């Protein structure tokens with residue numbers, strides 16, 4: 001991969017692998033989410049930020065500050081098949097004192113057609129106390145020289161799906177998958193649960209008949225709290241409708257919320 | 269990737285990804301196992317066999333016959349770091365009427381040094397009845413034109429670890445991880461549990477202190493029976509031993525039916 005001509009975005013190509021595809025012989029949404037993370041990491045390395053998933057500066061590191069995902073929104077028009085080459089372009093933008101945004105555009109390398117798009121909201125947090133904080137001028141100016149100055153949005157449309165408020169699922173849930181636990185393959189280099197595992201956990205409570213007859217078109221996920229390595233999760237889903245679902249991940253014992261989200265599925 | 273000059277082996281390069289590494293910032297053994305699987309699949313595609321993990325012929329497909337892994341053996345000398353380029357060469361050999369063998373050699377692309385090696389034994393099974401069978405001349409002859417004629421072994425040594433008999437762990441196990449269940453990401457295109465998930469499950473019962481102070485050098489895993497999508501597994505481990513060795517057993521959570529057995533060898537960091 002490489003930074004583009006103006007140095008304000010990064011592109012990379014990936015060939016879809018045999019173990020990365022589902023029953024349709026096309027990439028799963030978790031494979032897509034892993035590729036989004038990989039290209040984000042390579043963009044951070046290319047300009048000198050940390051390469052641990054937190055994309056921090058030396059100033060943030062001394063203060064024990066990190067960037068954490070608050071929301072992920074992905075829309076796929078066509079999932080790439082096994083052996084296909086997908087090109088992904090990514091860029092970031094500061095969103096004032098609130099935090100930052102990372103956007104992505106996925107294209108079929110052969111046709112040049114846009115096959116997907118994604119956006120994510122990130123907030124600054126002290127890694128020890130877990131307390132959020134606004135972004136100061138000093139940290140903001142370190143990032144601004146690597147971002148487009150004029151707004152560039154993967155989801156420009158007014159009142160689009162990426163910015164909608166997600167309600168809390170009410171008990172009883174229509175469907176559930178209980179007792180979900182991470183294994184070492186679900187952890188990152190810092191022993192934290194990888195963000196993509198939560199997408200997988202949300203999808204576990206979708207009935208297999210839906211997965212067999214529909215394709216996932218849109219997923220919006222809010223991240224409220226981390227699942228620790230020794231935590232156990234319950235995945236809950238209720239149909240709200242194309243088929244739409246409301247989702248909730250919570251700790252198996254006390255019922256503490258870790259994530260909430262929505263999915264939109266199209267009949268095959 | 270591509271078939272080599274003589275057409276009897278296949279090579280492919282991979283760059284280690286950010287989400288593919290563990291706490292050491294180097295590729296996990298499950299990332300290595302996935303890469304071995306990917307290069308095996310690309311080798312099968314290159315010569316016309318099926319690309320579903322079973323590497324079958326048209327004759328096998330009509331008879332509902334598939335190849336399934338009976339044993340996997342991996343030895344890693346150096347795990348590649350994030351951003352490193354690893355080159356993997358793979359080839360197959362028929363092992364008479366018993367089945368076939370697939371071998372791999374992993375190299376550091378920059379230095380050319382061998383950083384790992386692996387071997388796997390495959391048997392022919394009817395997909396529906398799950399009954400094993402010997403390999404007939406007709407099936408054997410279809411594969412032989414794509415294999416070296418003279419023996420070529422990733423593990424040539426006379427008393428090598430890849431062919432040792434594995435005993436059955438006796439209760440009580442020293443360590444355990446109970447209630448392990450596959451999720452959709454653990455399944456292949458045919459909705460079967462991916463072979464690499466079992467490696468992950470075996471490793472779940474190794475204490476975290478061992479993982480934090482040692483590096484996995486060798487893993488030998490026997491595959492006895494499949495874990496279905498709605499099955500639940502228990503992973504059991506007992507120390508058998510600057511080197512630590514363990515004996516492993518995966519079995520169904522309820523009736524205790526064995527699905528896998530294996531051994532691991534770890535060296536102090």
Ligand SMILES: CN(C)C(=O)c1cc2cccc(F)c2o1
Pocket residue numbers: 040043044045047049054055067092093100102122143144146147
């Ligand atoms: C969540 N954060 C802070 C990031 O991922 C991030 C921001 C950014 C700006 C310019 C260039 C980059 F590579 C950037 O990475």
Ligand SMILES: CN(C)C(=O)c1cc2cccc(F)c2o1
Pocket residue numbers: 308311312313315317322323335360361368370390411412414415
């Ligand atoms: C487990 N099996 C049967 C295989 O993976 C296999 C055997 C083989 C022989 C020549 C060339 C190939 F590509 C081969 O693939």
